[PDB]
Tab-separated table of C-alpha atoms and ligand atoms in Angstrom:
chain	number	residue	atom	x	y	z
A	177	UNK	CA	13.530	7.328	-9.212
A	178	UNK	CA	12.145	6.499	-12.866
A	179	UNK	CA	10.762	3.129	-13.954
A	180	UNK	CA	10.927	0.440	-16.444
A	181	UNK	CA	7.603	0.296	-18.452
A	182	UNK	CA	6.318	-3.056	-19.466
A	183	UNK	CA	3.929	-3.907	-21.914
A	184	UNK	CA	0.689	-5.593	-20.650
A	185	UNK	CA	1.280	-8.441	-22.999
A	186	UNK	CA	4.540	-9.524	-22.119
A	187	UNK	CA	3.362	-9.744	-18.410
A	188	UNK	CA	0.038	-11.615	-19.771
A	189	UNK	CA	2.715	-14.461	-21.729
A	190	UNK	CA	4.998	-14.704	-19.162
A	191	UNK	CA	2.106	-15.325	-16.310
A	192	UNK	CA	0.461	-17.805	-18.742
A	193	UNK	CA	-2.725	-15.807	-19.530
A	194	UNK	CA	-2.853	-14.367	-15.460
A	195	UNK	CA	-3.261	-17.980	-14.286
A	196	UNK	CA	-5.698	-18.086	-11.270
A	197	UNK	CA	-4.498	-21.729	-9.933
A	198	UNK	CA	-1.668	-21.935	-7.029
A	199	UNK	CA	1.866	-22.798	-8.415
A	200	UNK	CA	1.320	-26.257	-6.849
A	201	UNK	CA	-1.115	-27.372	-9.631
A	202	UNK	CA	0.871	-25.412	-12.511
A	203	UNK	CA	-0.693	-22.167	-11.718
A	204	UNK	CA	1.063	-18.905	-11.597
A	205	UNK	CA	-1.163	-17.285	-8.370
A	206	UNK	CA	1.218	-16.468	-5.451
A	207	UNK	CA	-1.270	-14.718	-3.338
A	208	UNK	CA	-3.938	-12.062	-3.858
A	209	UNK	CA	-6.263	-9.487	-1.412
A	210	UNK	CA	-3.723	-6.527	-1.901
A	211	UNK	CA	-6.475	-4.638	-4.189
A	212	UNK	CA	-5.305	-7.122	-7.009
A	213	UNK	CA	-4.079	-10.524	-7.736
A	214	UNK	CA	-0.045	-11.616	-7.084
A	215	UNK	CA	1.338	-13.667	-10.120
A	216	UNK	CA	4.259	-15.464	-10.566
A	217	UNK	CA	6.645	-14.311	-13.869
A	218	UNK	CA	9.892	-14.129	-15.651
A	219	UNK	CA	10.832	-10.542	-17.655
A	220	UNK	CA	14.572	-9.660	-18.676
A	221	UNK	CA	16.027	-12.969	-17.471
A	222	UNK	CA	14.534	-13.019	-13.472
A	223	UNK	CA	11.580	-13.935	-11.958
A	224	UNK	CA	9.340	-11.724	-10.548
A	225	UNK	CA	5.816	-10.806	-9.087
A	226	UNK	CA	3.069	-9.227	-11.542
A	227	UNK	CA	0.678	-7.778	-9.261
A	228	UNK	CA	-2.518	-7.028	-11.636
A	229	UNK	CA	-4.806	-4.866	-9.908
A	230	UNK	CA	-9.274	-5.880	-9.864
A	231	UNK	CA	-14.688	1.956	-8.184
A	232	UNK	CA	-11.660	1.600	-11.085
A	233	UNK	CA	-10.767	5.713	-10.376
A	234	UNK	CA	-10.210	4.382	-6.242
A	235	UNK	CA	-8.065	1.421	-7.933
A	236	UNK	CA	-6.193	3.821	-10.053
A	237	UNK	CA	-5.499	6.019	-7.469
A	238	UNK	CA	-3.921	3.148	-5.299
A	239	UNK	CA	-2.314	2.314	-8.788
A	240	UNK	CA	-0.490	5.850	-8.384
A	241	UNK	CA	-0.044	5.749	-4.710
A	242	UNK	CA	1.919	2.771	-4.943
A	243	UNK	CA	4.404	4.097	-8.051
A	244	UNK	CA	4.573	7.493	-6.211
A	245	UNK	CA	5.749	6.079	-2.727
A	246	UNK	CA	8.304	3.260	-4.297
A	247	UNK	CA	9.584	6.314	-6.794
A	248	UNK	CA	10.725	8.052	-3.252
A	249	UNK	CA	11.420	5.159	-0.908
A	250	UNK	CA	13.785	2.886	-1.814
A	251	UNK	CA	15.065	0.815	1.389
A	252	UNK	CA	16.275	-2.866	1.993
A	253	UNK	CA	13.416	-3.611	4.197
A	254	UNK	CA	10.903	-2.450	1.669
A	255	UNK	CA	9.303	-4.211	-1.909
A	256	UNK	CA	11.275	-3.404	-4.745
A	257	UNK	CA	9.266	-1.743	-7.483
A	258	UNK	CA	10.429	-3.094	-10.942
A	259	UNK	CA	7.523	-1.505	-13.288
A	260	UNK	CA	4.201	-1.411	-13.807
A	261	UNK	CA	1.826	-1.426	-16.629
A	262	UNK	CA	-1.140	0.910	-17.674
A	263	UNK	CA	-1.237	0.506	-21.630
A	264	UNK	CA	-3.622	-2.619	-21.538
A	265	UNK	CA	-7.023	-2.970	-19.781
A	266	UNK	CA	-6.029	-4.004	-16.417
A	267	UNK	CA	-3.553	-1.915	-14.165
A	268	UNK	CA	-0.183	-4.004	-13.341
A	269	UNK	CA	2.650	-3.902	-10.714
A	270	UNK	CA	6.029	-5.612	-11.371
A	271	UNK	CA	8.080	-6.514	-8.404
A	272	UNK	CA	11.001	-8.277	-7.393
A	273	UNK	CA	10.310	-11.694	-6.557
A	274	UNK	CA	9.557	-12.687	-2.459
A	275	UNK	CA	10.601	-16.461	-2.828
A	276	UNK	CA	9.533	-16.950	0.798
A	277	UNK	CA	6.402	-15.214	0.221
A	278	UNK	CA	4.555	-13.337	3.169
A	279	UNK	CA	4.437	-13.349	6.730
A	280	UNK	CA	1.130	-14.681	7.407
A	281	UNK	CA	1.997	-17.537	5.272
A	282	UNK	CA	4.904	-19.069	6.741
A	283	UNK	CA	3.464	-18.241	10.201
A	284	UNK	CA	0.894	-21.063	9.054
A	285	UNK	CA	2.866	-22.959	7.413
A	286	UNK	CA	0.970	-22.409	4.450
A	287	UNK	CA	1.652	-25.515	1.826
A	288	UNK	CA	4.331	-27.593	3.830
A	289	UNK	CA	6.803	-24.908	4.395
A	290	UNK	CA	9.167	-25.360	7.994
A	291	UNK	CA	7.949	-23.492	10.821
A	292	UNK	CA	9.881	-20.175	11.367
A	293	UNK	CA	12.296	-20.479	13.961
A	294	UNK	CA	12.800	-17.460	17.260
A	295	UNK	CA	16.335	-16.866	15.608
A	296	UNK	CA	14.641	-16.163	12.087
A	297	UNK	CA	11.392	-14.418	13.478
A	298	UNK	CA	13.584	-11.667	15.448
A	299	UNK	CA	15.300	-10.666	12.626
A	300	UNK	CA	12.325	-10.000	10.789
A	301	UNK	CA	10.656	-8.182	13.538
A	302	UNK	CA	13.663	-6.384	12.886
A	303	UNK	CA	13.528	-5.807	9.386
A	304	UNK	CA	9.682	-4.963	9.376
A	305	UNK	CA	10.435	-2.071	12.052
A	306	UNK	CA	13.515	-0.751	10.054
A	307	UNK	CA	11.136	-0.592	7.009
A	308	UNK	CA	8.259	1.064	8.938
A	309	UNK	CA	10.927	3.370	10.347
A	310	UNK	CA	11.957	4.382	6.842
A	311	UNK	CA	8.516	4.951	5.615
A	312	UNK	CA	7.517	7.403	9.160
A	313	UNK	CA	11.098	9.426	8.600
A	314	UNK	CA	9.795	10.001	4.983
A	315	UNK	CA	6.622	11.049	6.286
A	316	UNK	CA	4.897	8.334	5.225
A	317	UNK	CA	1.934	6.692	6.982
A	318	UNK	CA	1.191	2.620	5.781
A	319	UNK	CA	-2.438	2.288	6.879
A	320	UNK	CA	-2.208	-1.465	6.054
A	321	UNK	CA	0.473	-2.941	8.545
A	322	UNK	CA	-0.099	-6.567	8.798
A	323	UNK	CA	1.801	-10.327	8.113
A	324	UNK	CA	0.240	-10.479	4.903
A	325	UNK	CA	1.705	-7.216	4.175
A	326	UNK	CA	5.186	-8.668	5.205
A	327	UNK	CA	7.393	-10.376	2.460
A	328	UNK	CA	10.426	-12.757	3.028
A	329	UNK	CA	13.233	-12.169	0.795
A	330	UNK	CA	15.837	-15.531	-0.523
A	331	UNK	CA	17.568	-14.610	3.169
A	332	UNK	CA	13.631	-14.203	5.121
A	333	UNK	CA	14.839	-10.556	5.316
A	334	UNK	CA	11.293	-8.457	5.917
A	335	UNK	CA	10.025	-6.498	2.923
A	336	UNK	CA	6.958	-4.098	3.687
A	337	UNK	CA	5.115	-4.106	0.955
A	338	UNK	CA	1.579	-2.439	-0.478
A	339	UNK	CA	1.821	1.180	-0.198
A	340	UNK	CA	-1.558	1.926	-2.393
A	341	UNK	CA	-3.255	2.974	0.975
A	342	UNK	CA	-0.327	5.485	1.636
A	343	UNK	CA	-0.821	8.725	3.291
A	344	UNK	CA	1.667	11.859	3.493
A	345	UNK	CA	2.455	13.379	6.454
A	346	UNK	CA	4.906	16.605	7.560
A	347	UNK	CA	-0.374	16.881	12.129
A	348	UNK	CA	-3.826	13.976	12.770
A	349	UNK	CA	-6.097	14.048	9.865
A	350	UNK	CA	-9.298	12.554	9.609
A	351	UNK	CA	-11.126	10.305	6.485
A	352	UNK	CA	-14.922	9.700	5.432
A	353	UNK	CA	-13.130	6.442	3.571
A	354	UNK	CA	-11.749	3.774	6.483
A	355	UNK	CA	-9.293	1.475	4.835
A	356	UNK	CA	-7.539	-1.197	6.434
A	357	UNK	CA	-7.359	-4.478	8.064
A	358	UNK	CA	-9.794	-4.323	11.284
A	359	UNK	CA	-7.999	-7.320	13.055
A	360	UNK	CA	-5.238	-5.161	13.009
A	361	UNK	CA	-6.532	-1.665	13.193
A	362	UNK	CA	-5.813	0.661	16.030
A	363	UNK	CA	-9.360	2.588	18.001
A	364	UNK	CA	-9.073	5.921	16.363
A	365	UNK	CA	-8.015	4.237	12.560
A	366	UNK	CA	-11.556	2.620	12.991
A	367	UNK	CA	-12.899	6.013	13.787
A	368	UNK	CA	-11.120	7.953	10.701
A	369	UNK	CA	-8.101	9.340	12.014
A	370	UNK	CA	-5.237	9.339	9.791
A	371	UNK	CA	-1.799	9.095	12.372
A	372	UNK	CA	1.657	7.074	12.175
A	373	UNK	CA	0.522	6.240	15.810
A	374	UNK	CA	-1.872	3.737	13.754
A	375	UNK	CA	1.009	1.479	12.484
A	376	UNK	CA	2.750	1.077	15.746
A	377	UNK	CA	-0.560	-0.253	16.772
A	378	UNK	CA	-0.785	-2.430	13.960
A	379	UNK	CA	2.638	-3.639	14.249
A	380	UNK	CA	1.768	-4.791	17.753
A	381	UNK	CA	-0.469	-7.097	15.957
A	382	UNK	CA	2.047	-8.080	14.253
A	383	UNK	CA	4.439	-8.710	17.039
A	384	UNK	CA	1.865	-11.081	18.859
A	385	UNK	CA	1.466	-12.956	15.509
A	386	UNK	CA	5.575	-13.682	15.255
A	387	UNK	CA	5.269	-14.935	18.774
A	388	UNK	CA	2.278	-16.768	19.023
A	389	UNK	CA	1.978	-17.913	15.334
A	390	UNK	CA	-1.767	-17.204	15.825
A	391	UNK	CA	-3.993	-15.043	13.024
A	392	UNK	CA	-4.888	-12.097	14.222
A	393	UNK	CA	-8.051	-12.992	13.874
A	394	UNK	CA	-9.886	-16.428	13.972
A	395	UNK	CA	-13.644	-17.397	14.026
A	396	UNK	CA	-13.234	-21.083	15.884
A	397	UNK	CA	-10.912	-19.488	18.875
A	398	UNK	CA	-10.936	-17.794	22.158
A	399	UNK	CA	-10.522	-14.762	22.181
A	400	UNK	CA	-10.971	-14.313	18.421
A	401	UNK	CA	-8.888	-11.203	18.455
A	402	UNK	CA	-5.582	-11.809	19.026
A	403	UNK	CA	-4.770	-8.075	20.354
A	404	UNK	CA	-7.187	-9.556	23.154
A	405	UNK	CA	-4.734	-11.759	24.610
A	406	UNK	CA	-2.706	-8.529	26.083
A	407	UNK	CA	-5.778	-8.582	29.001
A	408	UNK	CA	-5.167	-12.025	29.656
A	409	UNK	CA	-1.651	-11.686	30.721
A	410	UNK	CA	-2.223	-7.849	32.065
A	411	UNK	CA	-5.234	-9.616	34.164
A	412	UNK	CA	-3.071	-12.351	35.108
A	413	UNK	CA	-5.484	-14.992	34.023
A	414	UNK	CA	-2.679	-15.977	31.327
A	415	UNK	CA	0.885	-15.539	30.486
A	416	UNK	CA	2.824	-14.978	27.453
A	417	UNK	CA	4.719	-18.551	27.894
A	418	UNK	CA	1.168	-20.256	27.808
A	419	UNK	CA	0.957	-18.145	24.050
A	420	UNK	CA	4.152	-19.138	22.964
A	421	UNK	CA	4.250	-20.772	19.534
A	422	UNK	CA	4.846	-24.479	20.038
A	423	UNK	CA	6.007	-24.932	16.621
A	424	UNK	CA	9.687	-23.374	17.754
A	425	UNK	CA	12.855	-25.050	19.412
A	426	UNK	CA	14.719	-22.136	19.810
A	427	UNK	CA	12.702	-19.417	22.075
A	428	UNK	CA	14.358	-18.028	25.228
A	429	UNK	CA	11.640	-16.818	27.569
A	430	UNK	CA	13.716	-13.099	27.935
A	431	UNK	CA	13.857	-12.611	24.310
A	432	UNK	CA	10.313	-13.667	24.084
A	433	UNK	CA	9.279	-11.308	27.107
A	434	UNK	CA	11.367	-8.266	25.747
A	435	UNK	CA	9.206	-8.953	21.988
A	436	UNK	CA	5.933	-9.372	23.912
A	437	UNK	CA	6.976	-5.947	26.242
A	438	UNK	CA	7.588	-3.733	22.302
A	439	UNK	CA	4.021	-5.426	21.478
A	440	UNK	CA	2.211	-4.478	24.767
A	441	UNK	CA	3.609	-1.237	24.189
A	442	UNK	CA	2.557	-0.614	20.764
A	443	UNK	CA	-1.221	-1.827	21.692
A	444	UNK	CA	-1.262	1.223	23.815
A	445	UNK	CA	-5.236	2.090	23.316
A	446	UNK	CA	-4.630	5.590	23.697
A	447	UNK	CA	-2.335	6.877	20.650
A	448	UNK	CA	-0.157	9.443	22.348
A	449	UNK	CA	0.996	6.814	24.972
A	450	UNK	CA	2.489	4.260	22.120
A	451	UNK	CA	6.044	4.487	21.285
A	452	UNK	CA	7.671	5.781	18.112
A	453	UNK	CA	8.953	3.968	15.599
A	454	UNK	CA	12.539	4.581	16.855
A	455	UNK	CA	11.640	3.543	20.521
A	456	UNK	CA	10.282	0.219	18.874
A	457	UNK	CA	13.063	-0.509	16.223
A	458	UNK	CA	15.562	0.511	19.696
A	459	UNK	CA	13.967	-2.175	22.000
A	460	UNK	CA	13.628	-4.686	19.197
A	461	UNK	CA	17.748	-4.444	18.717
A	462	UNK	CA	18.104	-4.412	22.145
A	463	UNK	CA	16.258	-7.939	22.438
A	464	UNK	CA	19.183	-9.162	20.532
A	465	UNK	CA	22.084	-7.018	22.276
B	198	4GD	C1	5.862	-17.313	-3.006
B	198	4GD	C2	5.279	-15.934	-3.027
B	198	4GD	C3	5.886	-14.748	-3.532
B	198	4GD	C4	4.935	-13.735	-3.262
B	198	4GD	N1	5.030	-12.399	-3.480
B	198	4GD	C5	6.040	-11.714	-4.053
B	198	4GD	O1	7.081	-12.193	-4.562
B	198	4GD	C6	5.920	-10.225	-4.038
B	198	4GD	C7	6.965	-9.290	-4.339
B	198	4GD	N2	6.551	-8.036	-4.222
B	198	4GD	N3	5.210	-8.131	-3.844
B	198	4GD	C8	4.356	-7.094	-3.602
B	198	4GD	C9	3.067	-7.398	-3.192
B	198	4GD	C10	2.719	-8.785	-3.041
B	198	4GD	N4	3.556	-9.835	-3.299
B	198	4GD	C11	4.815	-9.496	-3.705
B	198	4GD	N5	3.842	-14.305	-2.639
B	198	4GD	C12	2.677	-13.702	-2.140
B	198	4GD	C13	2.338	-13.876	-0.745
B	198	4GD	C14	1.157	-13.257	-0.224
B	198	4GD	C15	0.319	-12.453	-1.075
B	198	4GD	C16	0.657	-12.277	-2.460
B	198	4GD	C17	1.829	-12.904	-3.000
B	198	4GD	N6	4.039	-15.659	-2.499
């Protein structure tokens, strides 16, 4: 798969001069912390996402990373590539637009936005495991699996998105660079090692965060690791109905078990004893069926 090419000055008019304030003031920022800053745009009649990227060699290799990846995997579940931009000085991405932006975001309820209900969140715990699945049976290993990785689509269908961390696989390799997100990151991904193992962990994360609507991560909370919580409950001290996100009507305590159960799973500390990607996109359709 070939791309469009875009100038860097049409993408520079049509995200008024990279505007830096949120689309609430009259801003075109959607988002940024992806290596880059997400703008809002509109090229050949549609809106879209400019992603400007933003050592600049490490950048440009992400740059490449990303093109080469969306060039061979094209799947429902995943970010849709548009074209990028090299020509100016800074490096851009064009995307299809995520009018429900990320994961993390609606989780919070970022700017006003309706809390995401069980019936919504299943489907794209779904969606994000039938895009990780894609990426795995292509050999491909994300290295950044996290909410704010996770784009909702017009319908809140998953997208996985940010594939400049990407690594081939078609074993265990090891790295002198460790990249990723640490509330998220899996023992031996902290260590170096370079394994799809590490995304099931990651996804786990993930998991906890659709069910509890909790950051992975917070510095005012107890624990302030949310892939903590899976000793509470194993210890007994807790269970996963006292985690439960409040801000839903619509959560049966089996579905919500059999999610929590894929999540437990996947935060397997030892790598070898985690399911596959199969195994997790299995019992995740299952849960529904
Ligand atoms: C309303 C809205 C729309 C979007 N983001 C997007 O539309 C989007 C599409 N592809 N893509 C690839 C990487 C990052 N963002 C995107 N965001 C967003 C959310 C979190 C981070 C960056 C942008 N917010």
């Amino acid at each position: 798969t070939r791309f469009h090419s875009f100038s860097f000055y049409e993408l520079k008019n049509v995200t008024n001069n990279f505007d830096e304030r949120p689309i609430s003031v009259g801003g075109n920022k959607m988002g940024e912390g992806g290596f880059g800053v997400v703008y809002k745009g509109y090229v050949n009649n549609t809106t879209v996402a400019v992603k400007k990227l933003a050592t600049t060699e490490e950048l440009k290799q992400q740059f490449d990373q990303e093109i080469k990846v969306m060039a061979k995997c094209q799947h429902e579940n995943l970010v849709e590539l548009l074209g990028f931009s090299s020509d100016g000085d800074d490096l851009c991405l064009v995307y299809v637009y995520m009018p429900n932006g990320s994961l993390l975001d609606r989780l919070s309820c970022l700017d006003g936005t309706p809390p995401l209900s069980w019936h919504m969140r299943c489907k794209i715990a779904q969606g994000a495991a039938n895009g990780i699945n894609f990426l795995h049976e292509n050999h491909h290993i994300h290295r950044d699996i996290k909410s704010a990785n996770i784009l909702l689509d017009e319908a809140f269908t998953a997208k996985i998105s940010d594939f400049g961390l990407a690594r081939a696989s078609e074993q265990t390799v090891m790295t002198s660079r460790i990249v990723g997100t640490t509330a998220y990151m899996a023992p031996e991904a902290l260590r170096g090692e370079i394994t799809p193992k590490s995304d099931i962990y990651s996804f786990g994360v993930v998991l906890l965060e659709i069910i509890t609507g909790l950051p992975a991560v917070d510095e005012h909370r107890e624990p302030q690791l949310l892939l903590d919580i899976k000793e509470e409950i194993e210890d007994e001290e807790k269970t996963i109905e006292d985690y439960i996100d409040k801000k839903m009507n619509d959560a049966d305590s089996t579905s919500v078990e059999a999610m929590y159960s894929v999540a437990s799973q996947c935060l397997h500390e030892k790598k070898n004893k985690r399911p596959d990607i199969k195994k997790v996109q299995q019992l995740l359709q299952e849960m529904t069926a």
